[PDB]
Amino acid sequence: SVLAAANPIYGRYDDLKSPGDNIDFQTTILSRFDMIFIVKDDHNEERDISIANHVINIHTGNANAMQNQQEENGSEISIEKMKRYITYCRLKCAPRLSPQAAEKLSSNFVTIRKQLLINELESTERSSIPITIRQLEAIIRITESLAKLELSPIAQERHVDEAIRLFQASTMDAASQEIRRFEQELKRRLPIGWSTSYQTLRREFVDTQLALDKALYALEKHETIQLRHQGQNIYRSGV
Amino acid sequence: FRKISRDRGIIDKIISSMAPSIYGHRDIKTAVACSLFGGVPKNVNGKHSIRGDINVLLLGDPGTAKSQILKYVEKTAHRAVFATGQGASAVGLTAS
Ligand SMILES: Nc1ncnc2c1ncn2[C@@H]1O[C@H](COP(=O)(O)OP(=O)(O)NP(=O)(O)O)[C@@H](O)[C@H]1O
Numbered sequence: 001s002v003l004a005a006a007n008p009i010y011g012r013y014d015d016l017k018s019p020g021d022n023i024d025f026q027t028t029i030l031s032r033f034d035m036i037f038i039v040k041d042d043h044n045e046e047r048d049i050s051i052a053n054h055v056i057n058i059h060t061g062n063a064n065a066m067q068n069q070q071e072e073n074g075s076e077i078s079i080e081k082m083k084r085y086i087t088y089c090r091l092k093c094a095p096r097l098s099p100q101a102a103e104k105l106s107s108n109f110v111t112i113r114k115q116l117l118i119n120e121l122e123s124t125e126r127s128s129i130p131i132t133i134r135q136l137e138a139i140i141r142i143t144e145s146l147a148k149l150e151l152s153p154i155a156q157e158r159h160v161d162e163a164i165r166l167f168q169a170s171t172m173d174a175a176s177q178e179i180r181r182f183e184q185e186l187k188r189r190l191p192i193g194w195s196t197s198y199q200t201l202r203r204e205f206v207d208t209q210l211a212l213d214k215a216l217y218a219l220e221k222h223e224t225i226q227l228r229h230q231g232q233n234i235y236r237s238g239v
Numbered sequence: 240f241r242k243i244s245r246d247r248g249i250i251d252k253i254i255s256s257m258a259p260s261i262y263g264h265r266d267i268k269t270a271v272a273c274s275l276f277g278g279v280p281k282n283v284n285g286k287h288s289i290r291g292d293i294n295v296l297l298l299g300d301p302g303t304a305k306s307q308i309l310k311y312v313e314k315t316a317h318r319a320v321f322a323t324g325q326g327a328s329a330v331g332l333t334a335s
């Protein structure tokens with residue numbers, strides 16, 4: 001196993017810049033990682049307060065007792081016992097996928113491939129973070145490892161759900177990252193506090209055509225619009 | 240040492256005593272004092288080790304005693320090494 005740690009180009013991730021400019025690594029080496037995490041300082045004040053209280057509890061030496069209580073409570077295990085347990089799992093078990101797990105994984109592969117295709121069209125360039133058939137095998141290995149914890153001789157639907165969730169939380173999240181006329185049209189034609197049902201906006205804009213969903217993503221990130229009611233109602237919530 | 244440590248002004252007398260022939264720059268003298276005494280290095284049950292050393296950057300204009308401060312710290316610290324700019328290679332800094 002290769003566990004690697006790196007900073008982006010420009011050191012801090014530089015969010016408004018393209019990922020293809022922020023990421024040094026070629027798509028060849030990137031594809032060899034089952035999970036790519038892009039880690040960012042969220043700067044959220046509640047989180048920062050929480051981290052500050054935690055880190056103070058580290059430096060004060062409170063954490064020495066806290067970890068021991070957590071271990072004796074059975075909510076945590078030690079370095080030594082975990083080391084032996086990883087060895088035992090690596091020597092006892094090597095699970096297969098059930099047929100149901102196999103189908104869910106296969107359909108998930110075509111789903112994420114479609115997402116990458118449309119994103120490459122929307123950004124009109126090949127993505128730096130890739131999704132390839134090697135990355136299906138990444139989700140397969142993760143599924144098997146998740147079953148390998150409990151020494152289950154087969155992986156099951158639940159393990160595939162967690163494997164898919166982890167891949168979505170890591171490699172997809174790494175991959176995930178004229179309209180100016182249409183947005184001011186929507187601002188003109190939907191005043192504050194009222195709702196346009198989405199499909200009518202789609203018909204009107206088409207009747208003038210993919211600029212619609214870019215406009216909605218921008219206006220939803222801002223306070224001006226709120227996608228109420230299962231996304232059916234475009235609500236001019238803010239300015 | 241035990242006697243002078245009792246003085247209410249001892250932190251300030253130490254800080255004033257850092258590089259005494261350099262005028263002003265009490266912030267630099269404070270940063271140098273903090274670095275030269277250092278923090279406490281810590282190790283959380285052996286499972287997580289934490290830096291005790293304090294790293295300091297003197298960023299600024301020419302003719303403002305920065306190099307002289309560093310030469311003083313080379314004079315004063317119990318183990319010290321000094322390496323200017325282009326004179327330091329990657330392996331000459333860490334190991335080779
Ligand atoms: N506050 C000061 N008190 C006394 N001498 C000073 C002071 N500021 C500068 N000098 C003198 O300025 C000269 C140059 O100091 P030096 O340490 O090389 O400055 P510097 O900050 O390193 N400038 P530079 O090397 O161009 O980045 C020395 O001979 C010092 O004595």
Ligand SMILES: [Mg+2]
Nearest residue numbers: 304305306307
């Ligand atoms: Mg200098």
